[PDB]
Amino acid sequence: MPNFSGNWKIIRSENFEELLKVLGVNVMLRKIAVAAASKYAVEIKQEGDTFYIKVSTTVYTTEINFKVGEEFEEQTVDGRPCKSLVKWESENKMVCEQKLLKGEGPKTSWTKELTNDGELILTMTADDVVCTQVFVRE
């Protein structure tokens, strides 16, 4: 039955560079990151409130495993390790708040949503900056 589960391919990416900028990434690396972001591919397996998510680009791949309501460890977009906790906001929207394991830095979070016309929308936030990325099913 249709939920977040599936193979998703990015179709749009808005404010990605500004987000990296807030996270301290210098301009040459941001431009390379933006170019890599146009091959983002996401594989999701969902069962009840347990998720497996694999995000990959051309040269890199990451997997996360979590259950809504339970703390897990992952990393911020710029690769600093964090403690994360996901909660539902509605039937097909979830929101994750992150806290840095070490150090200080911008407040980051992310949301994912299945829309009514079949898209997966990711938002990623750092302080005041919101990146939106839109995916469709492969």
Ligand X SMILES: *C/C(=C/c1ccc([N+](=O)[O-])cc1)C(=O)OC
CB under 6 A: which stretch of 23-31, 36-44, 65-73, 87-95 binds ligand X? 36-44
Phi and psi for 76 in degrees, rounded to 5? -60, 170
| Burial class of residue 135 (count of CB atoms within 10 Å of its CB; 0-12, 13-18, 19+) | buried
Question: Between 27 and 61, whose beta carbon lies closer to ligand X?
Answer: 61
Question: Between 17 and 133, whose beta carbon lies closer to ligand X?
Answer: 133
Interface with ligand X in residues 78-137 (CB under 6 A): 110, 112, 122, 124, 133
Tokens 């939106």, located at residue: 132
Question: Between 22 and 40, whose beta carbon lies closer to ligand X?
Answer: 40
Instruction: Collect all residues with Cβ–Cβ distance below 8 Å to 61 and sequence separation of at least 6.
Output: 54, 55
Question: Given the rule CB under 6 A, which residues bind ligand X?
Answer: 37, 40, 42, 53, 55, 77, 110, 112, 122, 124, 133
